[PDB]
Design a binder for this molecule. Sequence first.
Ligand code: 2H1
Length: 342
Amino acid sequence: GPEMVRGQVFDVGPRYTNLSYIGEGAYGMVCSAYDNLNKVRVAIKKISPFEHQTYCQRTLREIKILLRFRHENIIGINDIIRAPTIEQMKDVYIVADLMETDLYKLLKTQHLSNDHICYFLYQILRGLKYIHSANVLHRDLKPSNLLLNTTCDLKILDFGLARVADPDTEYVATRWYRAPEIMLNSKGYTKSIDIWSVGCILAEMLSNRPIFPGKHYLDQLNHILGILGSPSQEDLNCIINLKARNYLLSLPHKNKVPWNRLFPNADSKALDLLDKMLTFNPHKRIEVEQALAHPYLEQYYDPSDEPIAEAPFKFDMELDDLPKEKLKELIFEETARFQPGY
Ligand SMILES: Cc1cc(-c2nn(C(C)C)c3ncnc(N)c23)cc2ccc(OCc3ccccc3)nc12
């Protein structure tokens, strides 16, 4: 029979053995396992989406994007296991490189020196540069979506909320990393929403504490304005939405808090870059290639070793809202090339 982990079956043998609980991912339980073919311990995520439309849809979408993307700072799929007939397939197991932890857990437990911060930040933007080059917005960068290994290699996870970057909410664990414009007008304008999310992660690395921990929807904007200050007139004039602009004008005045008051031990170049990432106005916010070229990342900056996508990625939006059972069939087809062959 199959091995079991906290009452959950992991029918991944004979190739993968000696399973052990790591944690809960956003889509299912994650265990570590020994790969008997490559002689190495790997991470295996178990996914059970076929009891709902939204899970099947997001599963199919994630498998397609991670299979097309190939970059060292973005999580890759090494293998996929499922039953040989669609009628048996009640679960899907995705296999990936074993890392040590996520940035969420690391920051709850330990200090990061400037070199670790600097190197982690470089890798987030390196990976993000590839994603944005494919015309994709992540829209949910946060510490829990960043995996680290023991040699400080960093990988980005979770394109569940990813979209094309052209002009066009639900439940999420945290709004602490959402850019202000997302709640002030068009639903996540541009690539600057991700740069905002990365700035928030930088701040959190400097202090081990999230910078904008809103306790509810409107509170999130109060946290942001309480540090950045009230928007200037120029910045106010970039808020296109009538109600948003009015709402901003109705709020109490707040003065800017200097960065070196919040982060008194931080490298002044780090705070300079942070200032440019956490700019209220998304049109003035620093872009990924410019951020990589900031003096703070001079040690690692190397545009010959910062690859871009071969082409733009396209999401087939019509597959969304297809019937539960049809999505099950497409996931069977997409996972077929990992089934023992030839
Ligand atoms: C997002 C994600 C995280 C982890 C993971 N999560 N964790 C911890 C944070 C629980 C890890 N620790 C060490 N190594 C790891 N690989 C992990 C394993 C994963 C293993 C497979 C995987 O497949 C991506 C995927 C494919 C299809 C649908 C949804 C997700 N995604 C994983």
